Amino acid sequence: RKQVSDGVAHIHASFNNTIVTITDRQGNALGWATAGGSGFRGSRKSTPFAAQVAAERCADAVKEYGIKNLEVMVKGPGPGRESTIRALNAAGFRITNITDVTPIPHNGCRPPKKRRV
């Protein structure tokens, strides 16, 4: 139950939800928060108004692990992809590294051609 004080964090932001995880370098998820957790419907869940109020709800999910130094990984296009990071910095945590890992389309299967209006 001593604090670990060092680790990693993973950010996901899609066009329909922001999902943030505080992780371990072994690939474990230690605590999580979702922007649909604020009760908001549809693409609201991808805005800073939703993503900025998931960060300290994610810091609450590791309250017995104890955090201080974090290395961040970020994926997805959603607007909330950085306000959730600044809100976590403003919670009293210190970012050791920031890296973007958003995929570049490879094969991609089938796209909308043929796109909804």
Partner: protein
């Protein structure tokens, strides 16, 4: 077209984002971006360069 197997040279033309440096930025003619894309493909199929990026 020339020296495309040297990766210590080729890494001056490709980004940390896993992409390519524009010909506007290297100051080069349009067909140098084709020469560069061919160098990239000819380094990929020779085990000199990776095919993809991400952590």
């Amino acid at each position: 077209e020339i020296d495309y197997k040297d990766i210590a040279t080729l890494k001056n033309y490709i980004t940390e984002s896993g992409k390519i440096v524009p010909s506007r930025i290297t100051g080069t003619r349009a067909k140098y971006q084709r020469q560069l894309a061919r160098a990239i493909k000819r380094a990929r199929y020779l085990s000199l360069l990776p095919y993809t990026d991400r952590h």
